[PDB]
Design a protein around this ligand. Structure first.
Ligand SMILES: Cc1cc(OCCCc2c3n(c4c(-c5c(C)nn(C)c5C)c(Cl)ccc24)CCCN(c2cc(C(=O)O)cc4c2ccn4C)C3=O)cc(C)c1Cl
Length: 151
């Protein structure tokens, strides 16, 4: 499943980098150029999204009461509820990932960094399993990058 692996490398790097403040300088895998431009796209757009929904993000974070990895594994159901039904567009997907980053920052603050990568997996798993065909028709991460690109 190459779509899942690409999505997880992008999402995982964006989440851990938002939580630690440090960029990950390890080379990317195949489709490296696209994934690097996708992660740059998320650094430009994602922080605007998080500031924009700060009130709603904080409310939802508190209502989910995340404390350990078992809590992290119990988040897919609400995630799926909020994300699955209705219209899909790239902004919705950025919002998914962006709240992911918001939560990853929280996990780092309560010294639960080890939960960031299960978080990332859960996010990727919900994305690819619920939006795969859409992702394929928007040409995947190249479609994402082209969508948010301005010259
Ligand atoms: C990591 C993780 C990610 C995650 O992601 C879930 C999917 C992303 C998401 C959406 N929404 C969220 C809200 C939220 C709520 C509730 N109220 N308000 C005001 C907000 C901003 C919060 Cl607090 C957090 C995340 C989201 C609802 C509104 C925007 N929207 C959207 C919803 C719709 C729609 O309902 O059809 C259409 C949309 C958008 C955005 C663009 N379009 C077209 C979403 O799909 C969820 C969880 C639990 C986890 Cl753990």
């Amino acid at each position: 499943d190459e779509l899942y692996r690409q999505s997880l490398e992008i999402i995982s790097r964006y989440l851990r980098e938002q939580a630690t403040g440090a960029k990950d300088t390890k080379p990317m895998g195949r489709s490296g150029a696209t994934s690097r431009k996708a992660l740059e796209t998320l650094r430009r757009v994602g922080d605007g999204v998080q500031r924009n929904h700060e009130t709603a993000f904080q409310g939802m974070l508190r209502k989910l009461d995340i404390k350990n990895e078992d809590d992290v594994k119990s988040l897919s159901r609400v995630m799926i509820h909020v994300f699955s039904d209705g219209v899909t567009n790239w902004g919705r997907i950025v919002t998914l990932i962006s709240f992911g980053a918001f939560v990853a920052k929280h996990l780092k603050t309560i010294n639960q960094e080890s939960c960031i990568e299960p978080l990332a997996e859960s996010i990727t798993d919900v994305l690819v399993r619920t939006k795969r065909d859409w992702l394929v028709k928007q040409r995947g991460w190249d479609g994402f990058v082209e969508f948010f690109h301005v010259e």
